[PDB]
Amino acid sequence: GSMSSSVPSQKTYQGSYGFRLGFLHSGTAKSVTSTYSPALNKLFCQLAKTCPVQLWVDSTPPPGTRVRAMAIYKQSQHMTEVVRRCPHHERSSDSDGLAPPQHLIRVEGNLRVEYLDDRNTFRHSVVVPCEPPEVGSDSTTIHYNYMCYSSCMGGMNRRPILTIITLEDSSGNLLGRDSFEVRVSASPGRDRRTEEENL
């Protein structure tokens, strides 16, 4: 376990541009590879499958704006432990060539992706340029991939995580923040349906 001496803020912050996340409304059929529970504010997804996350604003942010994703453990007693891939998957060398093998969160389909091992906090994050919607689209979507199961021993080790999405300007200053819980499992639709029944 790499231990950090800080914890990233999780405070929701729409900021000047009205930043917030959206998710597809995918339902809980057996065939779904990712599904989002609004009641739990929790994303359920399969290992290394595309998770679309929409980025919404009310006004266009300045040029060079970027969007960063970072995972932390949800439980207070684990929050200072850096979220990382388990030993097996890190050594599996399943990298797309861009992502460090230790990083839990990847972005797919974006050649401008940038990965950070923070030299002071030791936290991992992934950042991409933030684009307005393309011609013929009404949304900006990032395709995230979670590269370990929540049950991966020596990684998340059955502990729940939060993903924190931050909108930043070109200089790294905070423009907006949103977050959601994540469970990575082989049966996201069933797992979402079950957890919502336990409400």
Ligand X SMILES: *C[C@@H](C)C(=O)n1cc(C)c2c(-c3ccc4c(c3)CCN(C)C4)cncc21
Q: What distance in Å separates the CA atoms of residue 74 and residue 81, rounded to the nearest whole number?
A: 11
Written as one letter, the residue type at 187 is S
Q: Kindly state the smallest distance separating residue 176's Cβ from ligand X, in Å.
A: 8
Contact 55, 130 (CB under 8 A): yes
Distance of CA 22 to the CA centre of its chain: 13
Nearer to Zn ion, 68 or 103 (CB): 103
Q: Kindly state the smallest distance separating residue 47's Cβ from Zn ion, in Å.
A: 8
Which of the choices Zn ion, ligand X, none does residue 152 contact, using the CB cut-off of 5 to 8 A by kind? Zn ion
Q: Percentage helix, strand, coil, to 5, in the chain?
A: 10, 35, 55
Nearer to ligand X, 131 or 195 (CB): 131
Q: How many CB atoms lie within 10 A of CB 195?
A: 15
Annotated binding-site residue? 45: no
Q: List residues binding ligand X (CB under 6 A).
A: 55-57, 60-61, 65, 130-133, 138-140
Nearer to ligand X, 1 or 136 (CB): 136
Q: List residues binding Zn ion (CB under 5 A).
A: 86, 89, 148, 152, 155
